């Protein structure tokens, strides 16, 4: 359908314990496909999906060069942020960055992204026009002034409109057997007595890809948003995801409740009931 590519980066300083830890991962949609961890023995960017393994040694050398340069830039930027926030050198701090693109079904750029965070909070973000910035505070405004003088936004725009979408389309094509395959959820409803008076109906969705999914419980056709414990969608570990939604119902009233499941892999939404 529509698709996304994202690179995530985290640097965590650890004073007294060497240089900051740097970890970056790349995703297409909900599929992890590259990783780099600075604490690996002799760190290189490594494949995590079979369709990226075919890229040649020049690809991995350039990726690794980039990962190492980003780690070094982050190390200096962590020291800079100490100055910007008048912070001590003794504490651990976090710098995060995400960037990437979304493409539509025709393969055209839908939206580009580039945003940074310090200690878990927004720092500076490229706006959706890919031409202007949103700085979160007076510290990030210093960065914004530097990046305006350097026309950083124009340079990110050229990458996001160009290489980002062109490589995402290449990956979608090379990994089409998995990236362009939706696995619908395997679903069932389970029943768990809570007492003589009521029982849990739990609606399960297992083995599905991508992660986007909607599970809703209805009683005689009306949503039970109030009463629904919905867990966060969670990885199975084999590329697929799991989710369940649960409602507590009066015993004997189970046939009034239906679970509605929408997912890209299904022909049409499912309607499930408890079947003893």
């Amino acid at each position: 359908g529509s698709h996304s590519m994202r690179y995530f980066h985290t640097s965590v300083s650890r004073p007294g314990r060497g240089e900051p830890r740097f970890i970056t991962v790349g995703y297409v949609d909900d599929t992890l496909f590259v990783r780099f961890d600075s604490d690996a023995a002799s760190p290189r960017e490594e494949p995590r999906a079979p369709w990226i393994e075919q890229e040649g040694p020049e690809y991995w050398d350039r990726e690794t060069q980039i990962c190492k340069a980003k780690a070094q830039t982050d190390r200096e930027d962590l020291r800079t942020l100490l100055r910007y926030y008048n912070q001590s050198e003794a504490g651990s701090h976090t710098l995060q960055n995400m960037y990437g693109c979304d493409v539509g079904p025709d393969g055209r750029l839908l939206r580009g992204y580039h945003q940074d965070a310090y200690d878990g909070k927004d720092y500076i973000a490229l706006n959706e026009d890919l031409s202007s910035w949103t700085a979160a505070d007076t510290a990030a405004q210093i960065t914004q002034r530097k990046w305006e003088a350097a026309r950083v936004a124009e340079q990110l725009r050229a990458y996001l409109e160009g290489e980002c979408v062109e490589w995402l389309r290449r990956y979608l094509e090379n990994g089409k057997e998995t990236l362009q395959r939706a696995d619908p959820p395997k679903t069932h409803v389970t029943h768990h007595p809570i007492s003589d008076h009521e029982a849990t109906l739990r609606c399960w969705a297992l083995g599905f890809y991508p992660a986007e999914i909607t599970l809703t419980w209805q009683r005689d056709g009306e949503d039970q948003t109030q009463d629904t414990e919905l867990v966060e969608t969670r990885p199975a570990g084999d590329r697929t995801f799991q989710k369940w939604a649960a409602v507590v119902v009066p015993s004997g009233e189970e046939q009034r409740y239906t679970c509605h499941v929408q997912h890209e892999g299904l022909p049409k939404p499912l309607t499930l009931r408890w079947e003893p």
Binding site: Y7, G26, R62, E63, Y84, T143, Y159
Partner: peptide
């Protein structure tokens, strides 16, 4: 693939 350019805070 990743972008080549980055800029200090």
């Amino acid at each position: 693939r990743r972008k080549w350019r980055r800029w200090h805070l």
